[PDB]
Amino acid sequence: MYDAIVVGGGFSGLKAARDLTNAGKKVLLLEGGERLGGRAYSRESRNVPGLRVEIGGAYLHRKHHPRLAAELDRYGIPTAAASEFTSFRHRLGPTAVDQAFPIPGSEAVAVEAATYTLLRDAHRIDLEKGLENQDLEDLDIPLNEYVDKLDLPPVSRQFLLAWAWNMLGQPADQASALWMLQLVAAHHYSILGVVLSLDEVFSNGSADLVDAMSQEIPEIRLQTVVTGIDQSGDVVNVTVKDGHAFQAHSVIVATPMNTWRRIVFTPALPERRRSVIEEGHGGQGLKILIHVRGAEAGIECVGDGIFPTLYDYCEVSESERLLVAFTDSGSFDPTDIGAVKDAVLYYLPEVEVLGIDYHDWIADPLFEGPWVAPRVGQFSRVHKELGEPAGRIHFVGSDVSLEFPGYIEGALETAECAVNAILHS
Amino acid sequence: MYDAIVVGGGFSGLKAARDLTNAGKKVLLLEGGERLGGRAYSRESRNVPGLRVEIGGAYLHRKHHPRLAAELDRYGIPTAAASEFTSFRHRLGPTAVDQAFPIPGSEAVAVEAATYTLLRDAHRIDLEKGLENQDLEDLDIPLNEYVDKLDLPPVSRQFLLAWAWNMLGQPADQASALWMLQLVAAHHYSILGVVLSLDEVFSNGSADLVDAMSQEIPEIRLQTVVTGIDQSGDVVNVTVKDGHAFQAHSVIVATPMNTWRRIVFTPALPERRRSVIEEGHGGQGLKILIHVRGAEAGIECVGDGIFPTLYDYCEVSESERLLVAFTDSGSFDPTDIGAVKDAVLYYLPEVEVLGIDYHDWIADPLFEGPWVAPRVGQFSRVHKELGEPAGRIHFVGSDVSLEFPGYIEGALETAECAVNAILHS
Numbered sequence A, B: 001m002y003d004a005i006v007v008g009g010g011f012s013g014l015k016a017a018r019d020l021t022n023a024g025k026k027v028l029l030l031e032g033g034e035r036l037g038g039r040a041y042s043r044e045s046r047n048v049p050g051l052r053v054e055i056g057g058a059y060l061h062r063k064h065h066p067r068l069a070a071e072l073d074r075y076g077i078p079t080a081a082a083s084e085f086t087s088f089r090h091r092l093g094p095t096a097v098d099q100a101f102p103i104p105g106s107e108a109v110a111v112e113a114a115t116y117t118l119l120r121d122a123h124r125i126d127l128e129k130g131l132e133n134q135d136l137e138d139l140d141i142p143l144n145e146y147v148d149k150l151d152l153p154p155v156s157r158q159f160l161l162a163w164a165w166n167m168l169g170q171p172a173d174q175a176s177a178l179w180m181l182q183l184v185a186a187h188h189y190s191i192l193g194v195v196l197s198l199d200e201v202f203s204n205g206s207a208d209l210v211d212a213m214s215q216e217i218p219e220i221r222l223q224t225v226v227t228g229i230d231q232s233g234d235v236v237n238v239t240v241k242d243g244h245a246f247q248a249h250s251v252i253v254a255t256p257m258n259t260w261r262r263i264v265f266t267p268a269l270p271e272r273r274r275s276v277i278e279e280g281h282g283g284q285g286l287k288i289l290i291h292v293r294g295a296e297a298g299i300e301c302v303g304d305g306i307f308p309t310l311y312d313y314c315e316v317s318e319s320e321r322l323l324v325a326f327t328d329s330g331s332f333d334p335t336d337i338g339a340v341k342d343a344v345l346y347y348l349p350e351v352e353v354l355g356i357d358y359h360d361w362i363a364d365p366l367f368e369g370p371w372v373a374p375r376v377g378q379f380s381r382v383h384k385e386l387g388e389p390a391g392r393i394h395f396v397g398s399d400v401s402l403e404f405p406g407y408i409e410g411a412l413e414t415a416e417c418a419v420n421a422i423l424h425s
């Protein structure tokens, strides 16, 4: 038996397991899959033999992600400032302007007014209290209705919608307007910052940092799927698909939120948390890497397409590249290459699709979902609590961060606080 | 004797005198000078024989100035959309960009945040209550300190300051930050709108509308300076520099605010109003028409010069134009043509000054000031009341508008309410 069992080896689990270990605890780390990193997946392209692609979470911004910045600085991990955009091909109607910020002057007075409204509403949210504890229900409505109340003229209406589609991974009518605001608050009460935090990338991918952190964890078991976590006894008992149980004083659940319903907890979890855990969160972000000929470097496209955003990802050859599309999985079928062609040609009619590459996070039983985004109504009923301790069992990870939900910095933050919790118990 | 005496024949006096007359009152209009229009002065250029220039208030914007729009529509007065700007020559440092909106992206996140602060503060002001009745003292401080608290990066700091200098007619340390906000509220809670209301001009100058309105006033006396307004008796007694008094049930003071201290009121005015009336308001706007060779059409310059703004006014010849500078009278001496050359060359080094043209509103005893702007501290002590009736004597005009101070629309608004007041008495 162990001081702690860390269940899940994404960034959250890895930090906790490392920090407890360095603090002198006897820690075991249990990972269901055959790799470490979780939703930070860097592998080789399915399209381009020999090329390494980020299939999940890639970007960072130091001023917003100090914890991540410290990890990179600790292990000397190189980051490069992300591909600049020299070329704009929006689908925002004829009055829009082909630059990074495509709102035209004719819309400025409306943008000014909406900027005040968006920021006033976001200033409502205090990021330490939980979205259920601040009388924020009037905000917890479908985003399409929220944006309809703002009454924005065409370019900015659709610019806001397209980036809200990309970032939330939900179509406008499934997204919570209050979650959109939670992101604005996360970024220092900035709308712009939600998009400008696409600031840096790992020169050699997330795997660098995954490896540096795991180097410092002495006991890791891959292919070890947890199926029950039982704290009826004096000492927590962790049960597993094929194998002898493991036992520890503390357990940290560092697995996706949408997977918790596949573990048997004993006793059953506090009763507030239970419907949300069953239904899961609404996140459906679909990120597609598209292999293309005919595209020049630097293209960014935002607009009303089934891909709200489509932009450069990297150079493949002198005539070939990868672009990246965002849309959501219950709106687009990534295996319908003709669909993909139509979505792309919509913005970029000169460009031939050579192939596509994605991960079905939803279909993956180790995840059942990409990054968190609540269903309308969920997080103003229960939110802070989904990541509070239940007995000797802690809950951590991006999904349950109040400070940064959906980003690595969130995975790292939630583990700080759990590690600290345990160190005092 | 008359139902009403209207004292002053700027736009405020002219509307009142006309509306009372049309309502069937026996009205006399008394004007101290030799022309009608007041601070709306259109005469011939001192520089360009035969050319008609606006020396005072020229611009309008229909959506913000419905009363003005109705006057223009009533008399079929043509307006032309004001000279467009094709050419930018700012002095905002090396990171600024030569277009109408010169803030660079590097400053966007700061602009966003200040936009929220500026608009939150302006939303504090409710335009019907008066600036002294809303607990707004924390705002009634020097603008330089306010803008220092906002902590803006160079381009936008100086862009805001330069336009606040132009619009308020005061250097930053003499201007009330709360007045700056009053203007933002006046324009529908818009910062941008304060500058975008430079939208239209009178094709043939303000005089058109001055003449249409005066056509409908049957009794006007020019060169008739009022020196005492005495309402001790049953009927108000109006005394005059050289001449027999005039008498009326009602008197409307439609003269500048900074002139009221040159009239003897009986009884003396309510005691709150009296210090402000003595000291006067702080407005020192100085608008200079500059006759130039070497300038092309379309130039707008904003920057840190002794002229915060310098831009095209109109074509004189194919090689000659007028520009317009704004600055303030206690900072620049318009008769120092070398000073003017330096101020201009600062922004426009290729341009030769041929001459200048201005009106000393301050030195003019019929005005003693250009448009209103309070001294720091004044309008959060007394404001609404300066334009409330004192006995049978009413007070109207741009200076005392809560809705639009410094614009014609304000002169027109304050006269509506006085005319209505009288019609019910």
Ligand SMILES: Cc1cc2nc3c(=O)[nH]c(=O)nc-3n(C[C@H](O)[C@H](O)[C@H](O)COP(=O)(O)OP(=O)(O)OC[C@H]3O[C@@H](n4cnc5c(N)ncnc54)[C@H](O)[C@@H]3O)c2cc1C
Pocket: A007, A008, A009, A010, A011, A012, A013, A030, A031, A032, A033, A035, A036, A037, A038, A039, A040, A055, A056, A057, A058, A059, A060, A224, A225, A226, A227, A254, A255, A256, A259, A263, A285, A286, A287, A361, A365, A366, A367, A369, A370, A371, A372, A396, A397, A398, A399, A406, A407, A408, A409, A411
């Ligand atoms: C498409 C996409 C793009 C993204 N882009 C960014 C970005 O640009 N910047 C950024 O900061 N973040 C980004 N992210 C979000 C971020 O990468 C993740 O939210 C973050 O890595 C979450 O890590 P975690 O440690 O909380 O959980 P995860 O990384 O998901 O780790 C959970 C671990 O638990 C394991 N597991 C699951 N079930 C069991 C079981 N029962 N027993 C044992 N182990 C189990 C899984 O195999 C996994 O290793 C992106 C995410 C996605 C999906």
Ligand SMILES: Cc1cc2nc3c(=O)[nH]c(=O)nc-3n(C[C@H](O)[C@H](O)[C@H](O)COP(=O)(O)OP(=O)(O)OC[C@H]3O[C@@H](n4cnc5c(N)ncnc54)[C@H](O)[C@@H]3O)c2cc1C
Pocket: B007, B008, B009, B010, B011, B012, B013, B030, B031, B032, B033, B035, B036, B037, B038, B039, B040, B055, B056, B057, B058, B059, B060, B224, B225, B226, B227, B254, B255, B256, B259, B263, B285, B286, B287, B361, B365, B366, B367, B369, B370, B371, B372, B396, B397, B398, B399, B406, B407, B408, B409, B411
């Ligand atoms: C440089 C400058 C630029 C401007 N630009 C604009 C603009 O772009 N758009 C806009 O809407 N407004 C503008 N204005 C402001 C606007 O023109 C004035 O505030 C407005 O016309 C005020 O009119 P009024 O009727 O309130 O007073 P005034 O027009 O000033 O009229 C007062 C009248 O009283 C007379 N008078 C004074 N003393 C006596 C006396 N004791 N007895 C009898 N008569 C007396 C004066 O001769 C005058 O006719 C500008 C003003 C200035 C100074």
Ligand SMILES: NC(=O)c1cccnc1
Pocket: A057, A166, A167, A168, A183, A285, A371, A372, A405, A406, A407
């Ligand atoms: N939570 C988010 O909005 C998010 C994070 C990373 C990538 N895309 C979206």
Ligand SMILES: NC(=O)c1cccnc1
Pocket: B057, B166, B167, B168, B183, B285, B371, B372, B405, B406, B407
């Ligand atoms: N009150 C004002 O700011 C004003 C009005 C007209 C011209 N300049 C300034």
